[PDB]
Short mmCIF file of C-alpha atoms and ligand atoms in Angstrom, two decimals:
data_model
loop_
_atom_site.label_atom_id
_atom_site.label_comp_id
_atom_site.label_asym_id
_atom_site.label_seq_id
_atom_site.Cartn_x
_atom_site.Cartn_y
_atom_site.Cartn_z
CA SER A 1 -66.31 -58.81 -17.46
CA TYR A 2 -69.59 -60.59 -16.64
CA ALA A 3 -72.80 -59.20 -15.13
CA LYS A 4 -74.46 -62.61 -14.77
CA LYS A 5 -72.05 -63.36 -11.93
CA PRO A 6 -73.88 -62.47 -8.72
CA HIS A 7 -73.55 -59.51 -6.35
CA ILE A 8 -72.71 -61.77 -3.40
CA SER A 9 -71.20 -60.70 -0.10
CA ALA A 10 -67.42 -60.37 -0.36
CA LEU A 11 -67.15 -62.36 2.88
CA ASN A 12 -68.51 -65.31 0.85
CA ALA A 13 -66.38 -64.79 -2.22
CA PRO A 14 -63.17 -66.51 -3.36
CA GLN A 15 -60.19 -64.86 -1.67
CA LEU A 16 -58.47 -62.20 -3.78
CA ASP A 17 -55.00 -62.66 -2.25
CA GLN A 18 -55.13 -66.44 -2.78
CA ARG A 19 -55.98 -65.94 -6.45
CA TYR A 20 -52.80 -63.90 -6.92
CA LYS A 21 -50.53 -65.45 -4.26
CA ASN A 22 -47.81 -66.62 -6.68
CA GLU A 23 -47.93 -63.41 -8.72
CA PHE A 24 -47.86 -60.64 -6.05
CA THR A 25 -49.35 -59.78 -2.69
CA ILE A 26 -52.71 -58.00 -2.57
CA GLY A 27 -52.88 -55.06 -0.18
CA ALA A 28 -55.32 -52.52 1.29
CA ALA A 29 -54.77 -49.06 2.80
CA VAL A 30 -56.46 -48.62 6.18
CA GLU A 31 -57.26 -46.33 9.12
CA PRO A 32 -57.03 -47.67 12.69
CA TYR A 33 -60.79 -47.33 13.24
CA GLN A 34 -61.42 -49.88 10.47
CA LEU A 35 -59.60 -52.45 12.64
CA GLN A 36 -62.45 -52.01 15.15
CA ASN A 37 -65.16 -52.66 12.53
CA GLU A 38 -66.22 -56.26 12.08
CA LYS A 39 -66.81 -56.07 8.31
CA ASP A 40 -63.49 -54.34 7.57
CA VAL A 41 -61.63 -56.78 9.82
CA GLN A 42 -63.29 -59.72 8.07
CA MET A 43 -62.50 -58.16 4.68
CA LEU A 44 -58.81 -57.76 5.55
CA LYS A 45 -58.53 -61.31 6.93
CA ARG A 46 -60.34 -62.79 3.91
CA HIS A 47 -58.91 -61.01 0.87
CA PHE A 48 -55.64 -59.22 1.67
CA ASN A 49 -52.13 -60.27 2.67
CA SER A 50 -50.51 -56.80 2.71
CA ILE A 51 -51.42 -53.57 4.50
CA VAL A 52 -50.48 -49.87 4.54
CA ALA A 53 -51.67 -46.87 6.55
CA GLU A 54 -53.81 -44.35 4.69
CA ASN A 55 -52.59 -41.59 7.01
CA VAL A 56 -51.25 -42.49 10.45
CA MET A 57 -47.68 -43.17 9.27
CA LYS A 58 -47.24 -39.88 7.36
CA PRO A 59 -44.70 -37.46 8.93
CA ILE A 60 -47.18 -35.12 10.61
CA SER A 61 -48.98 -38.09 12.19
CA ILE A 62 -45.73 -39.55 13.56
CA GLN A 63 -43.84 -36.41 14.75
CA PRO A 64 -46.29 -33.47 14.81
CA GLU A 65 -43.91 -31.57 17.11
CA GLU A 66 -40.17 -32.13 17.37
CA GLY A 67 -39.51 -34.82 19.97
CA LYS A 68 -43.22 -35.81 20.04
CA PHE A 69 -43.58 -39.27 18.51
CA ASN A 70 -47.10 -40.65 18.21
CA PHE A 71 -46.69 -44.33 17.34
CA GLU A 72 -49.92 -45.67 18.93
CA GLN A 73 -52.02 -45.50 15.77
CA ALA A 74 -49.28 -47.01 13.58
CA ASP A 75 -48.65 -49.66 16.25
CA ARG A 76 -52.26 -50.84 15.96
CA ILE A 77 -51.86 -51.41 12.22
CA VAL A 78 -48.55 -53.24 12.76
CA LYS A 79 -50.05 -55.43 15.50
CA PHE A 80 -53.01 -56.39 13.30
CA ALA A 81 -50.77 -57.21 10.35
CA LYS A 82 -48.49 -59.44 12.43
CA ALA A 83 -51.44 -61.30 13.94
CA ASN A 84 -52.77 -62.03 10.45
CA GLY A 85 -49.52 -62.75 8.59
CA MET A 86 -49.73 -59.61 6.44
CA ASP A 87 -46.81 -57.79 4.86
CA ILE A 88 -46.56 -54.13 5.92
CA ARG A 89 -45.66 -51.10 3.81
CA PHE A 90 -44.68 -47.84 5.51
CA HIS A 91 -46.17 -44.74 3.89
CA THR A 92 -44.17 -42.56 4.17
CA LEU A 93 -40.92 -41.26 5.68
CA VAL A 94 -40.69 -38.06 3.59
CA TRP A 95 -43.35 -36.03 1.75
CA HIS A 96 -44.09 -32.37 0.98
CA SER A 97 -47.68 -32.81 2.22
CA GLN A 98 -48.97 -33.83 5.67
CA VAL A 99 -45.56 -32.82 7.03
CA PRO A 100 -45.02 -30.72 10.18
CA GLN A 101 -43.92 -27.14 9.61
CA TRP A 102 -41.41 -27.22 12.49
CA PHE A 103 -39.05 -29.12 10.15
CA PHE A 104 -38.45 -26.00 8.06
CA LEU A 105 -38.08 -23.31 10.76
CA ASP A 106 -34.64 -21.95 11.64
CA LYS A 107 -33.28 -21.50 15.16
CA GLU A 108 -35.11 -18.17 15.55
CA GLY A 109 -38.39 -19.70 14.43
CA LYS A 110 -38.31 -18.16 10.95
CA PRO A 111 -38.96 -20.01 7.67
CA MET A 112 -35.69 -21.40 6.32
CA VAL A 113 -36.81 -20.75 2.73
CA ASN A 114 -36.63 -16.98 3.37
CA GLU A 115 -32.96 -16.98 4.42
CA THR A 116 -30.77 -14.89 2.09
CA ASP A 117 -27.35 -15.44 3.74
CA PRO A 118 -25.48 -18.35 2.09
CA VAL A 119 -23.65 -19.18 5.33
CA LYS A 120 -26.97 -19.41 7.17
CA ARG A 121 -28.59 -21.30 4.31
CA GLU A 122 -25.92 -23.97 4.61
CA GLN A 123 -26.48 -24.15 8.36
CA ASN A 124 -30.20 -24.54 7.74
CA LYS A 125 -29.51 -27.34 5.27
CA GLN A 126 -27.50 -29.27 7.84
CA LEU A 127 -30.12 -28.64 10.53
CA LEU A 128 -32.93 -29.89 8.27
CA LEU A 129 -30.89 -32.94 7.27
CA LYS A 130 -30.22 -33.65 10.94
CA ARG A 131 -33.93 -33.41 11.73
CA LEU A 132 -34.68 -35.65 8.75
CA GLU A 133 -32.20 -38.27 9.94
CA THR A 134 -33.57 -38.28 13.49
CA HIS A 135 -37.16 -38.64 12.24
CA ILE A 136 -36.22 -41.62 10.05
CA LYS A 137 -33.90 -43.12 12.67
CA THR A 138 -36.57 -43.15 15.39
CA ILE A 139 -39.22 -44.68 13.12
CA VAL A 140 -36.99 -47.31 11.55
CA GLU A 141 -35.37 -48.33 14.85
CA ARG A 142 -38.88 -49.12 16.12
CA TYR A 143 -40.29 -50.96 13.07
CA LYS A 144 -37.30 -52.50 11.22
CA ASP A 145 -38.14 -56.06 12.33
CA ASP A 146 -41.86 -55.76 11.41
CA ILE A 147 -42.15 -53.65 8.24
CA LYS A 148 -40.47 -55.02 5.13
CA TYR A 149 -41.40 -52.32 2.57
CA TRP A 150 -40.73 -48.59 2.95
CA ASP A 151 -41.87 -45.59 0.93
CA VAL A 152 -38.77 -43.58 1.85
CA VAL A 153 -39.64 -40.51 -0.21
CA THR A 154 -42.95 -39.71 -1.91
CA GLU A 155 -43.59 -37.36 -4.87
CA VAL A 156 -40.12 -35.81 -5.11
CA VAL A 157 -40.36 -35.31 -8.91
CA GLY A 158 -42.66 -32.59 -10.20
CA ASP A 159 -45.21 -33.15 -12.94
CA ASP A 160 -43.09 -30.75 -15.07
CA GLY A 161 -40.26 -33.31 -14.96
CA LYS A 162 -38.13 -31.19 -12.62
CA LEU A 163 -37.48 -32.03 -8.99
CA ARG A 164 -40.46 -30.86 -6.97
CA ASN A 165 -39.53 -27.49 -5.44
CA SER A 166 -40.83 -28.28 -1.97
CA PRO A 167 -39.23 -26.77 1.15
CA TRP A 168 -37.21 -30.02 1.33
CA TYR A 169 -35.66 -29.21 -2.06
CA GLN A 170 -35.41 -25.44 -1.55
CA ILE A 171 -33.59 -25.80 1.76
CA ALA A 172 -31.39 -28.86 1.27
CA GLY A 173 -31.32 -29.58 -2.46
CA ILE A 174 -31.11 -33.13 -3.80
CA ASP A 175 -29.26 -34.30 -0.66
CA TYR A 176 -32.51 -34.66 1.31
CA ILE A 177 -33.39 -37.57 -0.97
CA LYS A 178 -29.96 -39.21 -0.59
CA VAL A 179 -29.97 -38.71 3.19
CA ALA A 180 -33.47 -40.20 3.50
CA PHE A 181 -32.48 -43.47 1.81
CA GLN A 182 -29.07 -43.68 3.49
CA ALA A 183 -30.59 -43.22 6.93
CA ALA A 184 -33.28 -45.82 6.26
CA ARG A 185 -30.66 -48.38 5.22
CA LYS A 186 -28.33 -47.46 8.10
CA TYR A 187 -30.87 -47.87 10.91
CA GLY A 188 -32.98 -50.57 9.23
CA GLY A 189 -30.34 -52.87 7.79
CA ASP A 190 -30.13 -54.78 4.53
CA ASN A 191 -33.40 -56.69 4.84
CA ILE A 192 -35.87 -53.78 4.52
CA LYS A 193 -36.75 -52.69 0.98
CA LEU A 194 -36.55 -49.00 0.09
CA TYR A 195 -38.86 -47.37 -2.46
CA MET A 196 -39.27 -44.07 -4.24
CA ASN A 197 -43.01 -43.46 -4.49
CA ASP A 198 -44.91 -41.24 -6.93
CA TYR A 199 -48.12 -40.76 -8.92
CA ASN A 200 -48.36 -40.43 -12.70
CA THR A 201 -45.20 -42.51 -12.98
CA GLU A 202 -46.50 -43.43 -16.47
CA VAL A 203 -46.59 -39.84 -17.73
CA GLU A 204 -43.82 -37.97 -19.50
CA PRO A 205 -41.84 -35.88 -18.63
CA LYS A 206 -42.19 -37.21 -15.05
CA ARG A 207 -41.52 -40.85 -16.00
CA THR A 208 -38.09 -40.33 -17.57
CA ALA A 209 -37.17 -37.74 -14.93
CA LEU A 210 -37.97 -40.36 -12.27
CA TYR A 211 -35.94 -42.91 -14.22
CA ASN A 212 -32.97 -40.55 -14.58
CA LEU A 213 -33.08 -39.49 -10.91
CA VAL A 214 -33.10 -43.06 -9.57
CA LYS A 215 -30.45 -44.19 -12.07
CA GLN A 216 -28.19 -41.34 -10.94
CA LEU A 217 -28.75 -41.90 -7.21
CA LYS A 218 -28.00 -45.63 -7.54
CA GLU A 219 -24.80 -44.87 -9.46
CA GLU A 220 -23.81 -42.69 -6.48
CA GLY A 221 -24.44 -45.63 -4.13
CA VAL A 222 -27.78 -44.45 -2.70
CA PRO A 223 -29.75 -47.58 -1.66
CA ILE A 224 -32.97 -47.71 -3.70
CA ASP A 225 -34.68 -51.07 -4.16
CA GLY A 226 -37.82 -50.16 -6.04
CA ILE A 227 -40.46 -47.78 -7.35
CA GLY A 228 -43.86 -47.38 -5.72
CA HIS A 229 -46.46 -46.55 -8.38
CA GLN A 230 -49.44 -44.89 -6.71
CA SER A 231 -51.59 -45.78 -9.77
CA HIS A 232 -54.36 -43.27 -9.13
CA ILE A 233 -55.87 -44.00 -12.53
CA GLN A 234 -59.02 -43.69 -14.62
CA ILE A 235 -61.06 -46.13 -16.67
CA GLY A 236 -59.27 -45.04 -19.85
CA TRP A 237 -56.06 -43.30 -18.80
CA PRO A 238 -53.27 -44.22 -18.65
CA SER A 239 -53.24 -46.88 -21.35
CA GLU A 240 -52.19 -50.43 -20.56
CA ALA A 241 -49.43 -50.07 -23.17
CA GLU A 242 -48.02 -47.10 -21.25
CA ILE A 243 -48.32 -48.84 -17.88
CA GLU A 244 -46.39 -51.78 -19.35
CA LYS A 245 -43.70 -49.49 -20.78
CA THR A 246 -43.33 -47.86 -17.37
CA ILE A 247 -43.01 -51.09 -15.38
CA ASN A 248 -40.50 -52.46 -17.89
CA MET A 249 -38.51 -49.23 -17.89
CA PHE A 250 -37.88 -49.26 -14.14
CA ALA A 251 -37.40 -53.02 -14.07
CA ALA A 252 -34.48 -52.58 -16.48
CA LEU A 253 -32.68 -50.67 -13.72
CA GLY A 254 -33.00 -53.70 -11.45
CA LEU A 255 -35.83 -52.07 -9.49
CA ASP A 256 -38.79 -53.82 -7.93
CA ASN A 257 -42.17 -52.32 -8.81
CA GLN A 258 -45.04 -52.06 -6.36
CA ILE A 259 -48.51 -50.75 -7.12
CA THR A 260 -49.11 -48.81 -3.91
CA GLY A 261 -52.37 -46.84 -4.16
CA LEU A 262 -54.43 -48.42 -6.88
CA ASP A 263 -57.87 -46.99 -7.48
CA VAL A 264 -59.81 -46.82 -10.73
CA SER A 265 -61.84 -43.62 -10.58
CA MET A 266 -65.16 -43.45 -12.39
CA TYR A 267 -64.35 -39.93 -13.60
CA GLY A 268 -61.94 -37.86 -15.65
CA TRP A 269 -59.84 -34.98 -14.41
CA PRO A 270 -60.94 -32.63 -13.00
CA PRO A 271 -63.72 -35.02 -11.93
CA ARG A 272 -67.39 -34.28 -12.53
CA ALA A 273 -68.84 -36.74 -10.06
CA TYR A 274 -72.30 -38.07 -9.46
CA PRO A 275 -73.70 -36.89 -6.11
CA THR A 276 -74.36 -40.38 -4.69
CA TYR A 277 -73.27 -43.94 -5.31
CA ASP A 278 -76.80 -44.85 -6.37
CA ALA A 279 -76.76 -42.24 -9.17
CA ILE A 280 -73.79 -43.91 -10.91
CA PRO A 281 -75.13 -45.76 -13.99
CA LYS A 282 -74.61 -49.51 -14.19
CA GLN A 283 -72.68 -49.08 -17.45
CA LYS A 284 -69.86 -47.28 -15.59
CA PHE A 285 -69.31 -50.42 -13.50
CA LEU A 286 -69.15 -52.56 -16.65
CA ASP A 287 -66.59 -50.16 -18.16
CA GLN A 288 -64.61 -50.25 -14.91
CA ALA A 289 -64.75 -54.06 -14.84
CA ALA A 290 -63.28 -54.34 -18.34
CA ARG A 291 -60.54 -51.88 -17.39
CA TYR A 292 -59.77 -53.98 -14.30
CA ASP A 293 -59.80 -57.10 -16.47
CA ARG A 294 -57.12 -55.66 -18.78
CA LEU A 295 -55.19 -54.12 -15.89
CA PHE A 296 -54.73 -57.28 -13.83
CA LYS A 297 -54.03 -59.38 -16.92
CA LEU A 298 -51.15 -56.97 -17.55
CA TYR A 299 -50.01 -57.13 -13.92
CA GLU A 300 -49.93 -60.94 -14.21
CA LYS A 301 -47.98 -60.73 -17.47
CA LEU A 302 -45.47 -58.55 -15.58
CA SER A 303 -45.61 -60.56 -12.36
CA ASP A 304 -41.88 -61.18 -12.36
CA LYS A 305 -41.41 -57.39 -12.04
CA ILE A 306 -44.19 -56.60 -9.51
CA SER A 307 -44.08 -57.81 -5.90
CA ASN A 308 -47.29 -56.15 -4.60
CA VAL A 309 -50.54 -54.55 -5.75
CA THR A 310 -52.20 -52.46 -3.03
CA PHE A 311 -55.60 -50.77 -3.37
CA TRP A 312 -55.91 -47.42 -1.61
CA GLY A 313 -58.84 -48.70 0.45
CA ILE A 314 -61.05 -51.71 1.17
CA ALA A 315 -64.54 -51.15 -0.25
CA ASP A 316 -66.34 -48.36 -2.09
CA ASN A 317 -67.88 -46.91 1.11
CA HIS A 318 -64.52 -45.29 2.01
CA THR A 319 -62.10 -43.75 -0.50
CA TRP A 320 -60.00 -40.58 -0.52
CA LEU A 321 -61.25 -40.08 -4.09
CA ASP A 322 -64.49 -38.69 -2.64
CA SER A 323 -62.53 -35.60 -1.58
CA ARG A 324 -61.99 -34.97 -5.31
CA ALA A 325 -65.55 -35.93 -6.34
CA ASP A 326 -66.78 -32.44 -7.25
CA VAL A 327 -70.46 -32.24 -8.25
CA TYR A 328 -71.32 -29.76 -11.01
CA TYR A 329 -74.85 -28.32 -11.23
CA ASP A 330 -76.49 -26.49 -14.14
CA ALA A 331 -78.75 -23.46 -13.73
CA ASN A 332 -81.80 -25.68 -13.11
CA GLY A 333 -79.97 -27.58 -10.36
CA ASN A 334 -79.47 -30.76 -12.40
CA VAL A 335 -76.19 -32.68 -12.09
CA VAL A 336 -73.67 -32.19 -14.91
CA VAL A 337 -71.22 -35.01 -15.59
CA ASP A 338 -70.27 -34.20 -19.21
CA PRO A 339 -66.79 -32.58 -18.96
CA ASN A 340 -67.50 -29.93 -21.61
CA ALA A 341 -71.11 -29.07 -20.74
CA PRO A 342 -72.44 -25.79 -19.29
CA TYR A 343 -72.78 -25.49 -15.54
CA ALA A 344 -73.45 -22.79 -12.94
CA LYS A 345 -71.93 -24.00 -9.66
CA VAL A 346 -69.77 -26.77 -8.23
CA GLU A 347 -69.93 -28.49 -4.84
CA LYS A 348 -66.34 -29.58 -4.31
CA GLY A 349 -65.69 -32.93 -2.67
CA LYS A 350 -69.41 -33.62 -2.17
CA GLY A 351 -69.93 -36.51 -4.63
CA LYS A 352 -69.16 -40.22 -4.72
CA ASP A 353 -66.50 -42.23 -6.55
CA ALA A 354 -66.52 -46.03 -6.80
CA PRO A 355 -62.95 -47.23 -7.39
CA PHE A 356 -62.56 -50.72 -5.94
CA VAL A 357 -63.78 -54.26 -6.72
CA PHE A 358 -65.95 -54.32 -3.57
CA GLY A 359 -69.09 -52.20 -3.29
CA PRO A 360 -70.09 -49.99 -0.38
CA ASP A 361 -72.28 -52.74 1.07
CA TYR A 362 -69.27 -55.13 0.99
CA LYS A 363 -70.70 -57.11 -1.94
CA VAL A 364 -68.57 -57.92 -4.99
CA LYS A 365 -68.72 -55.70 -8.07
CA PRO A 366 -68.37 -56.79 -11.70
CA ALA A 367 -64.73 -55.65 -11.40
CA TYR A 368 -64.23 -58.39 -8.80
CA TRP A 369 -65.44 -61.15 -11.13
CA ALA A 370 -63.26 -59.61 -13.84
CA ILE A 371 -60.08 -60.12 -11.78
CA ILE A 372 -60.92 -63.26 -9.81
CA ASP A 373 -61.27 -65.41 -12.94
CA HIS A 374 -58.52 -66.74 -15.23
CA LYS A 375 -59.72 -65.24 -18.52
CL1 LIG B 1 -50.03 -69.93 -10.38
CL1 LIG B 2 -59.82 -41.17 2.91
ZN1 LIG B 3 -48.88 -68.20 -11.32
ZN1 LIG B 4 -55.03 -64.58 2.99
ZN1 LIG B 5 -77.52 -43.76 -1.43
ZN1 LIG B 6 -44.27 -60.98 -8.41
ZN1 LIG B 7 -59.65 -42.61 4.55
ZN1 LIG B 8 -60.01 -61.48 -16.02
#
């Protein structure tokens, strides 16, 4: 939506959070070093009223060894948020990735998943659940008065619609999920909001499996306040109709919905990326802008069911999507972006994606104009 609107500096542009302030908060995911960078600091102060840690609040960053709690990096994000009146989301108490291996070792240092004895497997379950509770307890006791929104568990449903068979599930079964939420509520109180977080929440069979899991846990009294939709999406997929169906489905259970990791990739899956930002054709940005136009119009339509929309980054110069931006080369060394075309080699994670409404020079993209307006 609109290429005649100028590529002005985002520090001079109408504030994104103020545009949406009655509909939902607008958040950004950050690393502590960005709080020491003038442009990123000015971007966060100008456009965002919610914040989340890209990495420093994941389990391995918080307790990389048992009894070793590293809160300094997370503290810096909390301090910045409080000084600027930003909501805080905690990502994340429990996850099968970026999680320290000491959790899943038995008393003799051996992997719990390998235990054959049912008596010892039960002891390992209780040990893991005790470690889980202490991890959550320590974190929540420190941050309960500062952080309102919590991703308690992340990605616990597999893309096959079964519970993800992580070491958490192998060792302790479904109880690790129940214990995670119960501990967060116990040590954090009734005012913090507890979320189950996942990607491809729009996609069956994961969507209905997520729905059934949360419905069952809540019937058993497990405290779950909402769903965190990572929303790592493409220009085409998933459709707005299916996003709407998903939000409505979980809202019918009385759940809040938060969009926790929004980025609109320029590519399909697996991605065939351009090697640089400059090589991305202008038309891609127009296609992205129209997708963003439709997307935020739908979020506004559903604003009574969505409390927050967070982008997984600030501006196009820094995005985890670059780690997936594989560049395919044909036999002559020319870049191949057509998903079906011949190619000879791939350079994994070497290309550039462009997923936000702010460009890598901190100037606004056509996607910005598409969501700042009221059309
Ligand atoms: Cl309004
Ligand atoms: Cl990253
Ligand atoms: Zn309004
Ligand atoms: Zn603001
Ligand atoms: Zn360049
Ligand atoms: Zn709302
Ligand atoms: Zn990053
Ligand atoms: Zn619009």
